[PDB]
Write a protein that holds these residues in place. Structure first.
Motif, short mmCIF file in Angstrom:
data_model
loop_
_atom_site.label_atom_id
_atom_site.label_comp_id
_atom_site.label_asym_id
_atom_site.label_seq_id
_atom_site.Cartn_x
_atom_site.Cartn_y
_atom_site.Cartn_z
N UNK A 200 0.85 -1.19 0.00
CA UNK A 200 0.00 0.00 0.00
C UNK A 200 0.88 1.24 0.00
N UNK A 201 0.28 2.36 -0.39
CA UNK A 201 0.97 3.65 -0.44
C UNK A 201 0.11 4.69 0.26
N UNK A 202 0.77 5.76 0.70
CA UNK A 202 0.11 6.89 1.36
C UNK A 202 0.20 8.09 0.43
N UNK A 203 -0.94 8.48 -0.15
CA UNK A 203 -0.99 9.58 -1.11
C UNK A 203 -2.10 10.54 -0.69
N UNK A 204 -2.00 11.83 -0.99
CA UNK A 204 -3.09 12.75 -0.67
C UNK A 204 -4.36 12.44 -1.45
N UNK A 205 -5.50 12.71 -0.82
CA UNK A 205 -6.79 12.43 -1.43
C UNK A 205 -7.19 13.47 -2.47
N UNK A 206 -6.51 14.61 -2.54
CA UNK A 206 -6.85 15.62 -3.53
C UNK A 206 -6.45 15.19 -4.93
N UNK A 207 -5.43 14.35 -5.06
CA UNK A 207 -4.96 13.86 -6.35
C UNK A 207 -5.42 12.44 -6.65
N UNK A 208 -6.40 11.93 -5.90
CA UNK A 208 -6.90 10.58 -6.13
C UNK A 208 -7.60 10.47 -7.48
N UNK A 209 -8.39 11.47 -7.84
CA UNK A 209 -9.13 11.46 -9.08
C UNK A 209 -8.41 11.99 -10.30
N UNK A 210 -7.17 12.46 -10.14
CA UNK A 210 -6.42 13.04 -11.25
C UNK A 210 -5.20 12.20 -11.62
N UNK A 211 -4.30 11.94 -10.67
CA UNK A 211 -3.10 11.18 -10.96
C UNK A 211 -3.44 9.70 -11.11
N UNK A 212 -2.76 9.04 -12.04
CA UNK A 212 -3.02 7.63 -12.34
C UNK A 212 -2.09 6.75 -11.51
N UNK A 213 -2.68 5.79 -10.80
CA UNK A 213 -1.95 4.87 -9.94
C UNK A 213 -2.04 3.46 -10.52
N UNK A 214 -0.91 2.94 -10.98
CA UNK A 214 -0.81 1.58 -11.50
C UNK A 214 0.31 0.87 -10.76
N UNK A 215 -0.02 -0.21 -10.07
CA UNK A 215 0.98 -0.99 -9.35
C UNK A 215 1.69 -1.95 -10.30
N UNK A 216 3.02 -1.93 -10.28
CA UNK A 216 3.84 -2.74 -11.18
C UNK A 216 4.31 -3.97 -10.42
N UNK A 217 3.61 -5.08 -10.61
CA UNK A 217 3.97 -6.36 -10.01
C UNK A 217 4.29 -7.33 -11.14
N UNK A 218 5.52 -7.84 -11.15
CA UNK A 218 5.98 -8.77 -12.18
C UNK A 218 6.57 -10.00 -11.51
N UNK A 219 6.27 -11.17 -12.08
CA UNK A 219 6.76 -12.44 -11.56
C UNK A 219 7.70 -13.06 -12.59
N UNK A 220 8.98 -13.15 -12.23
CA UNK A 220 9.97 -13.74 -13.14
C UNK A 220 9.74 -15.22 -13.44
N UNK A 221 9.51 -16.11 -12.46
CA UNK A 221 9.32 -17.53 -12.82
C UNK A 221 8.11 -17.80 -13.70
N UNK A 222 7.02 -17.07 -13.53
CA UNK A 222 5.83 -17.29 -14.34
C UNK A 222 5.84 -16.49 -15.64
N UNK A 223 6.74 -15.51 -15.76
CA UNK A 223 6.86 -14.65 -16.95
C UNK A 223 5.54 -13.96 -17.28
N UNK A 224 4.82 -13.53 -16.25
CA UNK A 224 3.53 -12.88 -16.40
C UNK A 224 3.51 -11.59 -15.60
N UNK A 225 3.08 -10.50 -16.24
CA UNK A 225 2.98 -9.20 -15.60
C UNK A 225 1.53 -8.75 -15.63
N UNK A 226 1.00 -8.36 -14.47
CA UNK A 226 -0.37 -7.89 -14.34
C UNK A 226 -0.35 -6.45 -13.85
N UNK A 227 -1.03 -5.57 -14.57
CA UNK A 227 -1.14 -4.16 -14.22
C UNK A 227 -2.59 -3.83 -13.90
N UNK A 228 -2.81 -3.17 -12.77
CA UNK A 228 -4.15 -2.83 -12.31
C UNK A 228 -4.19 -1.37 -11.89
N UNK A 229 -5.31 -0.71 -12.15
CA UNK A 229 -5.52 0.68 -11.77
C UNK A 229 -6.46 0.74 -10.57
#
Ligand code: NAG
Ligand code: NAG
Ligand code: NAG
Ligand code: NAG
Ligand code: NAG
Ligand code: NAG
Ligand code: NAG
Lengths: 232, 219, 361, 198
Positions: A200-229
């Protein structure tokens, strides 16, 4: 001893290969010992061996378990060392330290009793896993923001990583641009073998609806990357 | 084998005053030529242990002068004068009378720092996670002190067990605090008939626990 | 695999004399009827040679090896076979083993696991050792073997060589002169501090024949020997045996006429030279000038006169002082075996490899 | 050894003793060869009567050496990519050794009055120290491959002697002959002297 080689899934009827990859060091003429450790608190010495420089005899020091199953093989020609065994009955998490004794000579030591001073050359890299089945792809799930107990105006959102067996997973937020508030929790063991992660991250709520938040989680053994907003 | 005890494991060390640790050995160390068969190992979590004091009461391996082993007879002790952030590590004692070396239990060594007010974070599962068949709700704490804390998950004002797990991280040099996250996972059928979820956070620095209650129906 | 025997009788060893025993050819030198004196390991006459008897008796003891030894044996029907040589008689060191079976003679030196009571058992079992791990030298030699046979042996260790002498002649110890020819020069190249003989027990449970053998010693002394046309030694004369043979050997003639001669000289033997120290005993301040924060320069070196004190070097780590002790000077073993005063102590510091630059000359 | 001069890359007889060409005219036997590696400036230490670092703790060379040593540079075989730490050298002993012998012992040397039970503490260290061998080191630290050749003469019959093939025989001529390493001039007549095998 600097680095160690190990890892991989082995059946209980199979055999492992515990070795320490040395470097420029007087490892050929320095006696050492093998010390394992429980996943919890508490170490346990498992094996030890000496060199032919000390004496014609190898100064054999075996406990019950290594006498029952294990064996040693010292080349006595270079900075190499290998551990051999036949089967495997209860071996889940063993550190298998590759430290060396603080006693160049061996004096007043019998075949079963031998004083030792200390050790200072522990290493990392001897991990064992026997419960590994497959490298399942990660399932990243977003977490709803909650601006509570965090000074109100600051929001608190994150991504949940589930359904993955191996512990090392590269987790980053905003492609590494954001630093303050990033806390990648270590993987926790479940009864199904696979692990879980919370980030988790701590970000101000004023930029919740403007700045885009995408968590970058990549798994090397499975060679699969999933991106979620993240979005409420 | 030799059995050992670690009764000073729960030692709230603080910078400013000395602290002591001890262990018990079944056999006697008096059969020696003035060399005490005691040593202390500092296991740094994450990379590798470190050696503090070797056999005998001498200083070696580049340790600071604060560390100083001691002991004469049927006793075991270690003298520490100053405690800093670099002292994060568990201690062990060993007697080298026999070759089957068996180390005892580990310690905790929780540094008694300034108590910080805990923060409670609740994260309901996402819609995709809810329809995936497995629902996991996370009760997370940030910048709370100390690392050891008691967390309880109450669902429909009832006790829950067998589905809550806790993960602990290491200390941070930025503010000297710990962060722990508790995840309560459940099946889809388990989450379907349940109404309200709440995680109880118990803090040593608070007179009463704080609990946040939420129900299904909001994102 | 060995069998322990506890039926041995506690009989102390017997002693007899060596009137004309312990003579052999010194080397491969050939001479034609001349008298020569050789300084070698020869047993002096009128000595006390040990006698062991085997009958029901089992006399196979272990004796330490201090100097050269002389062996004799009135051996009949081939009872004795070989000998055991080694410092500890185990597998921890390389030990010499002599094996003599009915086919040939084999000589092997290895790290045999020797037992406390080596013996042989028809005769086909050899319970002298269990097994040997590894060795290099293996040699095979041609067989050398009523009281109708007499055998004499001499063992020496010069330049790490195994010398054994054999001589068979038909005959208590008989009286006669018979030189021993050099037979085998085996380069053992090892250390030997103990010897032990091998005996074969014939099964008939076991029966041992009446065999008598003698074991003795050797002494470094000059012996006068006369050769002939064939080079055989005729007689042996020892100067240290008696003053008569001393006069015979100094004149280099076996026949001494009527007269007086000054064969040698005699004097008392000093024992020790000791000095007491009840007087001044404070240590000279060598440590504070060898270990000081300030030292003089090479151009202006300090000069200090040291006297009225004892120059202790044990506090300066005489065994190994971690210094440049490779200078010749006075030898460290005899450095303590000296006595001097008025020592000069000049200290300075240099740079580079100029340690060898500061040398006499 | 005429072809062995250049079958191996070593300096041709950089030692003192018999001339390299004159070695064919010797009847020496029972040679001794020892294999060891030195570091840089230890070439000067290996000499008869020399007192160097090797000659004080490792190998003593007597005055009556009756031989010499052979050394050469080895910057490839003895120097791999990693540091070569497979050979060590003694620095601590109570007294000097004896010539033409070796005494290997993994013992802690004690310096102070108190004894040590194989513990490296206050005044107790180990004599053996690792060689610093790397291919990037200078001439003063490169590993040098050293073998010693001994050409002593024994009074025993020389089973080795010298490599001087075979030739014809002559009789009744006052000629110079070299037999068993000794030179003499005279005829070769027939005499009835009895000879024992030894
Ligand atoms: C030899 O020694 C024994 C006892 O050791 C003694 O009785 C005997 O007289 C000695 N013989 C001679 C000739 O010295
Ligand atoms: C018996 O003699 C032969 C000689 O041909 C030898 O090779 C063999 O080793 C001898 N037996 C034993 C047990 O030494
Ligand atoms: C000889 O055998 C012993 C044990 O059987 C072994 O330790 C040694 O290395 C062997 N030597 C050779 C040259 O094979
Ligand atoms: C042989 O060993 C003995 C026993 O330690 C010793 O006194 C002697 O000096 C050794 N001799 C040689 C030549 O090594
Ligand atoms: C020397 O030996 C020969 C061998 O035939 C013999 O005839 C001769 O008599 C011997 N000489 C003497 C002086 O006995
Ligand atoms: C040596 O000591 C004795 C007694 O301790 C004393 O009488 C004598 O005078 C001393 N000699 C010198 C030269 O000091
Ligand atoms: C002797 O010298 C060493 C190093 O030069 C130093 O560490 C030690 O303190 C000195 N001892 C004395 C008594 O001066």
């Amino acid at each position: 001893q600097l680095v160690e080689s190990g890892g991989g899934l082995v059946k209980p009827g199979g055999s492992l290969r515990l070795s320490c990859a040395a470097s420029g060091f007087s490892f050929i003429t320095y006696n050492m010992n093998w010390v394992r450790q429980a996943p919890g608190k508490g170490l346990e010495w498992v094996s030890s061996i000496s060199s032919n420089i000390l004496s014609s005899t190898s100064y054999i020091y075996y406990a019950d378990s290594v006498k029952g199953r294990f064996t040693i093989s010292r080349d006595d020609a270079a900075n190499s060392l290998f551990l051999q065994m036949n089967s495997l009955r209860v071996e889940d998490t063993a550190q298998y330290y590759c430290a060396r004794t603080r006693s160049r000579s061996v004096r007043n030591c019998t075949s079963a009793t031998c004083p030792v001073d200390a050790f200072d050359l522990w290493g990392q890299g001897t991990m064992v896993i026997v419960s590994s089945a497959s490298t399942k792809g990660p399932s990243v799930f977003p977490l709803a923001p909650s601006s509570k107990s965090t000074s109100g105006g600051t929001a608190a959102l994150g991504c949940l990583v589930k359904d993955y067996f191996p512990e090392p997973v590269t987790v980053s937020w905003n492609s590494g641009a954001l630093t303050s508030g990033v806390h990648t929790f270590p993987a926790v063991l479940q009864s199904s073998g696979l692990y879980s992660l919370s980030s988790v991250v701590t970000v101000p709520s004023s930029s919740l609806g403007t700045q885009t938040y995408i968590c970058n989680v990549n798994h090397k053994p499975s060679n699969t990357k999933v991106d979620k907003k993240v979005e409420p | 084998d030799i059995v050992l005890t670690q009764s000073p494991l729960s030692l709230p060390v603080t910078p400013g005053e000395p602290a002591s640790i001890s262990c018990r050995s079944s056999q006697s160390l008096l059969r020696s030529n003035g060399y005490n068969y005691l040593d202390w190992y500092l296991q740094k979590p994450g990379q590798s242990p470190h050696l503090l004091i070797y056999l005998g009461s001498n200083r070696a391996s580049g340790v600071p002068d604060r560390f100083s082993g001691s002991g004469s007879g049927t006793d075991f002790t270690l003298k520490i004068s100053r405690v800093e952030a670099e002292d994060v590590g568990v201690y062990y004692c060993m007697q080298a009378l026999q070759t089957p070396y068996t180390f005892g239990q580990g310690t905790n060594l929780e540094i008694k720092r300034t108590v910080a007010a805990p923060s409670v974070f609740i994260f309901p599962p996402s819609d995709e996670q809810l329809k995936s068949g497995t629902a996991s709700v996370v009760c997370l704490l940030n910048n709370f002190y100390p690392r050891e804390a008691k967390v309880q998950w109450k669902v429909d004002n009832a006790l829950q067990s067998g589905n809550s797990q806790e993960s602990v991280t290491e200390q941070d040099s930025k503010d000297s605090t710990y962060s722990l996250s508790s995840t309560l996972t459940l099946s889809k059928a388990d989450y379907e008939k349940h109404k309200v979820y709440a995680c109880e956070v118990t803090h040593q620095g608070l007179s009463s626990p704080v609990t946040k209650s939420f129900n299904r129906g909001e994102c | 695999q060995c069998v322990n025997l506890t039926t041995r009788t506690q009989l102390p060893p017997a002693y007899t004399n060596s009137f004309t025993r312990g003579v052999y050819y010194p080397d491969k030198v050939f001479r034609s009827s001349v008298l020569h004196s050789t300084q070698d390991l020869f047993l002096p006459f009128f000595s006390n040679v040990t006698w062991f008897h085997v009958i029901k008796r089992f006399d196979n003891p272990v004796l330490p090896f201090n100097d050269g030894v002389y062996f004799a044996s009135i051996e009949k029907s081939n009872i004795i076979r070989g000998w055991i040589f080694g410092t500890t008689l185990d597998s921890k060191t390389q030990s010499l083993l002599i094996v003599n079976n009915a086919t040939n003679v084999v000589i092997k030196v290895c790290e045999f696991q020797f037992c406390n009571d080596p013996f042989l058992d028809m005769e086909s079992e050899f319970r002298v050792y269990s097994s040997a791990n590894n060795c290099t030298f293996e040699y095979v030699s041609q067989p050398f073997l009523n009281f109708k046979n007499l055998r004499e042996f001499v063992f020496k260790n010069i330049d790490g060589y195994f010398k054994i002498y054999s001589k068979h002649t038909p005959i208590d110890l008989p009286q006669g002169f018979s030189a021993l020819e050099p037979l085998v020069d085996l380069p053992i190249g090892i250390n030997i501090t103990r010897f032990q003989t091998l005996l074969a027990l014939h099964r008939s449970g076991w029966t041992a024949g009446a065999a008598a053998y003698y074991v003795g010693y050797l002494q470094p002394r000059t012996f006068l020997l006369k050769y002939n046309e064939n080079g055989t030694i005729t007689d042996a004369v020892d100067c240290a045996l008696d003053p008569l043979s001393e006069t015979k050997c100094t004149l280099k003639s076996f026949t001494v006429e009527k007269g007086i001669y000054q064969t040698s000289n005699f004097r008392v033997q000093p024992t020790e030279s000791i000095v007491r120290f009840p007087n001044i005993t404070n240590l000279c301040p060598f440590d504070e000038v060898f270990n000081a924060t300030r030292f003089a320069s090479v151009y202006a070196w300090n000069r200090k006169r040291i006297s009225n004190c004892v120059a202790d070097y044990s506090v300066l780590y005489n065994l190994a002082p971690f210094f440049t002790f490779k200078c010749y000077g006075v030898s460290p073993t005899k450095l303590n075996d000296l006595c001097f005063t008025n020592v000069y102590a000049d200290s300075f510091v240099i740079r580079g490899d100029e340690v060898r630059q500061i040398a006499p000359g | 050894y005429s072809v062995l001069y250049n079958l191996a890359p070593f300096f041709t007889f950089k030692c003192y003793g018999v001339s390299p060409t004159k070695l064919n005219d010797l009847c020496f036997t029972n040679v001794y060869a020892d294999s060891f590696v030195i570091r840089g400036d230890e070439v000067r230490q290996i000499a008869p009567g020399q007192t160097g670092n090797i000659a004080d703790y490792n190998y003593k060379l007597p005055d009556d050496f009756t031989g010499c040593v052979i050394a050469w540079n080895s910057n490839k075989l003895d120097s791999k990519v990693s540091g070569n730490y497979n050979y060590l050298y003694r620095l601590f002993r109570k007294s000097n050794l004896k010539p033409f012998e070796r005494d290997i012992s993994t013992e802690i040397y004690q310096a102070g009055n108190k004894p040590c039970n194989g513990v490296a503490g206050f005044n107790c260290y180990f004599p053996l120290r690792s060689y610093s061998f790397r291919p990037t080191y200078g001439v003063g630290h490169q590993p040098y491959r050293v073998v010693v050749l001994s050409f002593e003469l024994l009074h025993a019959p020389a089973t080795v002697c010298g490599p001087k093939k075979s030739t014809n025989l002559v009789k009744n001529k006052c000629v110079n002959f070299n037999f068993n390493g000794l030179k003499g001039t005279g005829v070769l007549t027939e005499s009835n002297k009895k000879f024992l095998p030894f």
